[PDB]
Enzyme design. Structure first.
Site, PDB file in Angstrom:
ATOM      1  N   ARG D 107       1.233  -1.464   0.293  1.00 52.98           N
ATOM      2  CA  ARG D 107       0.283   0.029   0.248  1.00 52.98           C
ATOM      3  C   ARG D 107       1.045   0.983   0.091  1.00 52.98           C
ATOM      4  O   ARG D 107       0.261   2.335   0.180  1.00 52.98           O
ATOM      5  CB  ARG D 107      -0.852   0.114   1.213  1.00 52.98           C
TER       6      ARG D 107
HETATM    7  N1  LIG Z   1     -11.072   2.852  -4.676  1.00 48.57           N
HETATM    8  C1  LIG Z   1      -9.994   2.098  -5.333  1.00 48.57           C
HETATM    9  N2  LIG Z   1      -9.455   2.306  -6.202  1.00 48.57           N
HETATM   10  C2  LIG Z   1      -7.903   0.844  -6.048  1.00 48.57           C
HETATM   11  N3  LIG Z   1      -7.500   0.893  -5.282  1.00 48.57           N
HETATM   12  C3  LIG Z   1      -8.714   0.842  -4.143  1.00 48.57           C
HETATM   13  C4  LIG Z   1      -9.739   1.476  -4.047  1.00 48.57           C
HETATM   14  N4  LIG Z   1     -10.947   1.241  -2.845  1.00 48.57           N
HETATM   15  C5  LIG Z   1      -9.121   0.369  -2.200  1.00 48.57           C
HETATM   16  N5  LIG Z   1      -8.236   0.375  -2.580  1.00 48.57           N
HETATM   17  C6  LIG Z   1      -7.122  -0.599  -3.099  1.00 48.57           C
HETATM   18  O1  LIG Z   1      -7.424  -1.499  -1.721  1.00 48.57           O
HETATM   19  C7  LIG Z   1      -6.844  -0.985  -0.315  1.00 48.57           C
HETATM   20  C8  LIG Z   1      -7.292   0.157   0.663  1.00 48.57           C
HETATM   21  O2  LIG Z   1      -6.304   0.213   1.687  1.00 48.57           O
HETATM   22  P1  LIG Z   1      -6.766   1.085   2.575  1.00 48.57           P
HETATM   23  O3  LIG Z   1      -5.940   2.094   3.911  1.00 48.57           O
HETATM   24  O4  LIG Z   1      -8.156   2.161   1.539  1.00 48.57           O
HETATM   25  O5  LIG Z   1      -8.296   0.511   3.238  1.00 48.57           O
HETATM   26  P2  LIG Z   1      -8.837   0.666   4.350  1.00 48.57           P
HETATM   27  O6  LIG Z   1     -10.046  -0.036   4.629  1.00 48.57           O
HETATM   28  O7  LIG Z   1      -8.626   1.775   5.195  1.00 48.57           O
HETATM   29  O8  LIG Z   1      -8.093   0.121   5.620  1.00 48.57           O
HETATM   30  P3  LIG Z   1      -7.209   0.006   7.142  1.00 48.57           P
HETATM   31  O9  LIG Z   1      -8.623  -1.039   8.453  1.00 48.57           O
HETATM   32  O10 LIG Z   1      -6.147  -1.174   7.316  1.00 48.57           O
HETATM   33  O11 LIG Z   1      -7.661   1.200   7.446  1.00 48.57           O
HETATM   34  C9  LIG Z   1      -5.277  -0.544  -1.514  1.00 48.57           C
HETATM   35  O12 LIG Z   1      -4.658  -1.452  -1.633  1.00 48.57           O
HETATM   36  C10 LIG Z   1      -5.763   0.276  -2.285  1.00 48.57           C
HETATM   37  O13 LIG Z   1      -4.467   0.452  -3.571  1.00 48.57           O
END
Ligand SMILES: Nc1ncnc2c1ncn2[C@@H]1O[C@H](COP(=O)(O)OP(=O)(O)OP(=O)(O)O)[C@@H](O)[C@H]1O
Ligand SMILES: CCC[C@H](O)[C@@H](C)C(=O)NC/C=C\C[C@@H](C)[C@@H](O)[C@H](C)[C@@H]1C/C=C\C[C@H](C)[C@H](O)Cc2cc(OC)cc(O)c2C(=O)O1
Ligand SMILES: Nc1ncnc2c1ncn2[C@@H]1O[C@H](COP(=O)(O)OP(=O)(O)OP(=O)(O)O)[C@@H](O)[C@H]1O
Lengths: 469, 100, 242, 121, 312, 312, 121
Positions: D107
């Site tokens: 990420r």
């Molecule tokens: N709209 C999107 N377009 C492209 N890739 C995305 C998108 N949404 C998520 N991803 C991918 O999925 C993952 C999303 O990570 P993110 O930090 O947004 O998740 P989170 O739900 O906040 O997780 P955490 O519980 O770890 O805080 C990353 O690999 C990102 O590349």
């Protein structure tokens, strides 16, 4: 001596008060002289006010408050050495075969530390079992932990007796067998079988020492019988310099007994009821089983899976320790292949070219590929019929069935009822024989010349005698 | 899902997988009959080819259905185990918190 | 017979909770396994040295909702030498006494089985196992193979023979001729509804006409090859009349 | 490399339950997340004012039955900056090191890839 | 990533101030947000800034992770009441506040609720979540991320939070594993404002027909899994093909996540969205392959991509 | 409604004293019962009455609900032992006796058992439930409604109560939602008296063949769901059709149900029931539509209703 | 009207836990039934001797996923002389008020229906 009165009695839990203000250490053994025999208590906690809490190795019916307890000055300590061979011992190291005292020079405490990191052996080694399918396809780790799987009737007891026999013959090392929460019926049947097979010999030399804890025993005893057996095997390793075998008739019963002990102590249960100490209890049992400078203890352990759920915490905790797995299964016995080891579901971490060497690894890999391809086609070749396949695939099927029959072996313990003389097949001879079969050098010999035979020289001799027939 | 719901669902999928494997076998016997008719007819030749084709398509579809049901039985066996464990531990935590 | 060990376990749970002992997996105490193993290990067969007496135990367990993985069922299943599983589905299909032969297993009693009965039941267990695998073909019995058709015929006749009226146990002399006729296949030609009437009629035929045969089965406990020929002749004669 | 944080979580569950701490989900204590996050937050890249040093972490987790949805896996996935997921099906098909390319993702490390590799991949 | 896309699209278009509270999330994510705020210019260190940042990240003790949300909310409330400004308040991972309440509660020695959560979970959430309202003095929008442990939406903290929210967006692991980003579950996500009196009748009709189509597909999906699509009726085959096109078309390249997708970011206007999905529901594009719908910024981009695929 | 039907059918014909105990039922259901019993002449305020009413309804504290059943028992036992009568005892929601015991249990200081029930649940119930027996001094016939707290018959209160009863009539929600009233599940409702020595061989055989037919139809539900009835054999098609006829034929209008069904209530004699189901099992009416079997008072009503639909 | 009795039951569960009373089924306190029943039994129609007055109750319950088998739903159904069941499928299909005519029943109000409306219905 340090002595103390009983002050509470609550099932298998007994509280003892040492007004001498020299309390027994945790895990010390204390003993009470009951009207019959003696009752042993193992210390589990120090409560304060000179009071210790203890778990009972025998039934507590008839105890009174103010009953007198002696601190034995150490953990439970059990007789060790040659006198143990051919004798049945309970958790506290008393004979239960009624053949009188064991009269060994030594007793050793069942609680001892694992070998230090500097003491550990730096590299893996194969224990050649003398069993072709094991020594080829799931080699046993010297000083390792091996899991044994399957239902009833798959032949576990005859396999275990042949392991005892083969390791005694090929390595000179004795065996210990410890039955943990075993059925007393099955322990009796095992003792009778072992006398018929002659690995126990009451007048002569015995190859195995027996330790038993019964389902009717309190949970503390069932929890400690594994440590008693381990301590005898450790004595043969540490002071006879042997390569010893230690059989555990069910390691799940050990987990369950530890869970019952924890619940009776009043600890909060964990992942699915098992004691919170589940992993450290298992680690304290298992990693005493290791190779050292003087020798090794190798352990074969029967892994019950509570609901076929391999993800259940007791399996999942046990699997972390196993260096190899042998699966006995009904189907392989239905083909008439004894010892009924599943050649594809059995696996070893030590089947890697560095440990075995490249020749062994290549032969075993080619055997596994041949059997897996044969099993994958075996349904569609039955749907289409045997001619409805490539002549190359039909040739690999001929090899696969010939190898699959070749994995059968005559056990010397079996000889008392199978009559055919048992044979112990060396590892090098096994590798060479299966290489030659995979090279096609015996594609002409009929597959029944490979059944129940002790290597490829014996395959040739059997083919010659059966052709003369 | 409650443990009984996933247990009943899994039992149903195992039943369906046996049913479709038997329908596969029955389709293979009907395919042998259809092959006999197809060769003997080699409008009647049209229906003999169309019947042999339908029976073969049904055999193929029931093989696919049985493989899909086998994979779904694997998935539901895993979810059943995880639900069993979660139920046991949650009820035991509730018992302990009631005892406290 | 301990006609419910679940209600003993519940009573011991009541005691333990009121004695304020720490609860376990279902508020049963940690030693409820020790309770049932201490009870059940007292059933034993003694040696000649100890007078050769025996105590046999039949514990009973009520699995709530058929859950064989509840705690007390798991414990007693692990303590006992074998299990007889009864099912409501089988009971309502009219299979009574409703024993699930697929799950029911006896680890040790196969060595104790009456030899005359063992000689015939060895075939019976295989024919039933095949029937249980092929049973799904019964929904679609058109264009079966002859092998699956014959498997359905034997399996149905054997299943319809294994049902039995309450409070009417049969002597082994009465059991072995009926299972012999079923497994060898003398009932394959008989309408499945008639098979129950066959049981009482064939026994009546054997008892009056062939009482010496049933007597020899009972007294020897084993079927000689002469006795298998005699039983074959009597069975074929009855079916010819039936 | 924290070669099993699942075993640290199990040891902390043991310690907490012997302390009579109330069990939570899967009987782990509620602060088992705090156990791992206060650990894994210590891996950092510092600024040039702080001497530019860095600590990289690779935690390791075992998933029973491959369940990435389990409590401890989802906790550590929610702490780390990506995961390498190793698929048992691939590993037994002899695809080793068995990296599943769909379920693994870095990420933040895409900015740190060697540019030549970024160009050719 | 969703919150950061919302920050980029909304936060500089919004007329008033903003507040961001990070509760129990990565200190890395906070530093990256602070850098992105300076680069975009929402923060000027030598000028006026539109956003205040409050952080108590997952390295902080449970007391700090519990209370930090109240500091962020107190700043937002001051802007609402005292300044009279329209505020938008972001809270990254409000579940970490609730979980921190459980952790301290375990040390306090209260008897836990449910899977070990504190008692007062509901009143704790009410006292936090009721302060976030809009008032006659000023508006407060808020966007709150809510972690869901083990993806279990039955978990007491999600289930408690659902009661308080005017709009909820549910992101599903399964949808994201299909590569449908932004991973929004179209059926579990719901809003108070999906009302024909609010969106207008055309939008309400298009949304209702999309929802009914996707619910039909979900109802088929296990029959489809066992038997394949060939067992379906012609009406079902058409409805499933269009449902697949529709759900594939709900994917969108976010500008903040082009590093992971290669495709540059798209904004799609609301009017353009409603016209696009109504035209899809008319079957006007049923001849276009599903791939042309995937990961594009509206129906004109679907036509352009379909033309590119057909030329290729 | 089932108890009130049994009261209408039996309690006026019984020719002996009766006791009704409401244990945590509605106070309204008690007032309605009292009006009914007062107008049907079971209670005559200016004459002789044959029923005694005991009430401890759900407005009462748990201490009262835990003891009103013992008052009802004590009156019924006085009629059985002292008068020497044959006595008919109705208890509505005897489950409420067990639940009230749980409500006090924790305040008494007991550690709760499996799902919070009192440890004494089985022995408190056994002490209550063993007094209701018939003896050599006189008989008691007892009808007890048992609530099921999430429709789960595996809950400790139902599961323990099953051990105490000569006849068990499991009502089920699913069957009632199919509109089959009185909604008795033909399977897992059972009686000790279903013996060929007691009912006779003809009754026993008819009931057995009915239960095999219904269990067969219950088995086929999976393939009828996924593969449809067209996959069935002709014998299975016949069995499914006849099972659906039998399943509707078990439905019946009660007089009190006349308010909810609109159909005058009917009593079907036991001999007429056995003969009707025997004739249906013989296939005598395989030509009649299934709805002619729904809510009818025997096979004469089936034929008359079939004629009515044919005239329509 | 009680626009959520379920929220009262949640508040009473909290209060019981703070009183250190052990939870029962679905972690609600064992007397969560008695809480609602003694409330709802207060809705009544009085006799002429008691002055003919009336109190009518309309408790509201939130089902989860329409699950009327859940503990609090079935508890309240066992008190309330009937129910109006409002169905999400009908509501989101735009059939509002979305009253499911099969699962809704009034156990006593048929005696109180307007006669002309009974005649025509
Ligand atoms: N709209 C999107 N377009 C492209 N890739 C995305 C998108 N949404 C998520 N991803 C991918 O999925 C993952 C999303 O990570 P993110 O930090 O947004 O998740 P989170 O739900 O906040 O997780 P955490 O519980 O770890 O805080 C990353 O690999 C990102 O590349
Ligand atoms: C252990 C937890 C697992 C957890 O469930 C998972 C969410 C997680 O934790 N991390 C993975 C997060 C991001 C990685 C993505 C950016 C991307 O690298 C991969 C390959 C995904 C894999 C999905 C579908 C493949 C398909 C061909 C798609 O269509 C491929 C695809 C095409 C595309 O066009 C530009 C844009 C895309 O984003 C994708 C896509 O999403 O693929
Ligand atoms: N035999 C029947 N015929 C027609 N309708 C019926 C019948 N039995 C029940 N019903 C319907 O079910 C409703 C509830 O019936 P009843 O009051 O007997 O249920 P219950 O099991 O006692 O419920 P509770 O737990 O609320 O006391 C009745 O008002 C009527 O609508």
């Amino acid at each position: 001596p340090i002595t103390g009165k009983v002050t509470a009695v609550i099932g298998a839990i007994v509280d003892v008060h040492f007004e001498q203000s020299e309390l027994p250490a945790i895990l010390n053994a204390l003993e009470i002289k009951t009207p019959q025999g003696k009752l042993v208590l193992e210390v589990a906690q120090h409560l304060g006010e000179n009071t210790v809490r203890t778990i009972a190795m025998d039934g507590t019916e008839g105890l009174v408050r103010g009953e007198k307890v002696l601190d034995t000055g150490g953990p439970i300590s059990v007789p060790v050495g040659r006198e143990t061979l051919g004798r049945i011992i309970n958790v506290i190291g008393e004979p239960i075969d009624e053949r009188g005292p064991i009269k060994s020079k030594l007793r050793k405490p069942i609680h001892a530390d694992p070998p230090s990191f500097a003491e550990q052996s730096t590299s893996a080694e194969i224990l050649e079992t003398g069993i072709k399918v094991v020594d080829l396809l799931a080699p046993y780790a010297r000083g390792g932990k091996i899991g044994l799987f399957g239902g009833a009737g798959v032949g576990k007891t005859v396999f275990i007796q042949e392991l005892i026999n083969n390791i005694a013959k090929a390595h000179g090392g004795f065996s210990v067998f410890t039955g943990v929460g075993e059925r007393t019926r099955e322990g009796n049947d095992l003792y009778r079988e072992m006398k018929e097979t002659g690995v126990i010999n009451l007048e002569g030399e015995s190859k195995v020492a027996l330790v038993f804890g019964q389902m009717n025993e309190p949970p503390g005893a069932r929890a400690r019988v594994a440590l008693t057996g381990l301590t005898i095997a450790e004595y043969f390793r540490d002071e006879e310099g042997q390569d010893v075998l230690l059989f555990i008739d069910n390691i799940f019963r050990f987990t369950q007994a530890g869970s019952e002990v924890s619940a009776l102590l009043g600890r909060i249960p964990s992942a699915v009821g098992y004691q919170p100490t589940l992993a450290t209890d298992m680690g304290l049992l298992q990693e005493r089983i290791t190779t050292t400078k003087k020798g090794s203890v190798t352990s074969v352990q029967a892994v019950y899976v509570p609901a076929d759920d391999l993800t259940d915490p007791a399996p999942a905790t046990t699997f972390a320790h196993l260096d190899a797995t042998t699966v006995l299964s009904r189907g392989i016995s239905e083909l008439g292949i004894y010892p009924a080891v599943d050649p594809l579901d059995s696996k070893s971490r030590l089947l890697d070219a560095a440990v075995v060497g490249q020749e062994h690894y290549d032969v075993a890999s080619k055997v596994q590929e041949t059997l897996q391809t044969y099993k994958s086609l075996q349904d569609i070749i039955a749907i289409l019929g045997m001619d409805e396949l490539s002549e190359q695939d039909k040739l690999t099927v001929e090899r696969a069935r010939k190898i699959q029959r070749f994995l059968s072996q005559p056990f010397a313990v079996a000889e008392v009822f199978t009559g055919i003389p048992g044979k112990l097949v060396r590892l090098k001879d096994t590798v060479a024989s299966f290489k030659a079969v995979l090279e096609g050098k015996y594609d002409n010999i009929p597959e029944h010349a490979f059944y129940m035979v002790g290597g490829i020289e014996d395959v040739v001799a059997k083919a010659e005698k059966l052709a003369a027939e | 899902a409650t443990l009984k719901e996933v247990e009943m669902r899994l039992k149903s999928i195992k039943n369906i997988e046996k049913i479709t494997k038997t329908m596969k076998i029955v389709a293979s016997t009907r395919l042998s009959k259809a092959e006999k008719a197809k060769i003997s007819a080699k409008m009647l030749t049209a229906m003999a080819q169309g019947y042999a084709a339908e029976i073969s398509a049904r055999r193929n579809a029931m093989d696919n259905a049985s493989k899909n049901a086998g994979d779904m039985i694997n998935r539901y066996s895993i979810l059943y185990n995880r639900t069993r464990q979660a139920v046991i531990t949650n009820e035991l935590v509730d018992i302990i918190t009631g005892a406290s | 017979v301990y006609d419910d060990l679940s209600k003993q376990a519940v009573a011991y749970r009541q005691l333990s909770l009121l004695l304020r002992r720490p609860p376990g997996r279902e508020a049963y105490p940690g030693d409820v396994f020790y309770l049932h193993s201490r009870l059940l290990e007292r059933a034993a067969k003694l040696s000649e040295k100890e007078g050769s007496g025996s105590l046999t135990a039949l514990p009973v367990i009520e699995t709530q909702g058929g859950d064989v993985s509840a705690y007390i069922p798991t414990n007693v299943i692990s303590i006992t030498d074998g299990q007889i599983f009864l099912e409501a589905e089988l009971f309502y299909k009219g299979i009574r006494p409703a024993i699930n032969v697929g799950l029911s297993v006896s680890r040790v009693g196969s060595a104790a089985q009456v030899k005359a009965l063992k000689q015939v039941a060895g075939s019976l267990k295989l024919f039933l196992a095949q029937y249980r695998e092929v049973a799904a073909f019964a929904q679609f019995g058109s264009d079966l193979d002859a092998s699956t058709k014959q498997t359905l015929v034997r399996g149905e006749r054997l299943t319809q023979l294994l049902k039995q009226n309450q409070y009417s146990p049969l002597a082994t002399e009465e059991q072995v001729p009926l299972i012999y006729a079923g497994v060898n296949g003398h009932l394959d030609g008989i309408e499945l509804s008639r098979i129950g009437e066959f049981e009482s009629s064939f026994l009546s035929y054997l008892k009056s006409n062939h009482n010496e045969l049933l007597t020899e089965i009972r007294e020897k406990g084993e079927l000689s090859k002469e006795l298998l020929a005699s039983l074959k002749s009597a069975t074929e004669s009855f079916v010819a009349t039936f």
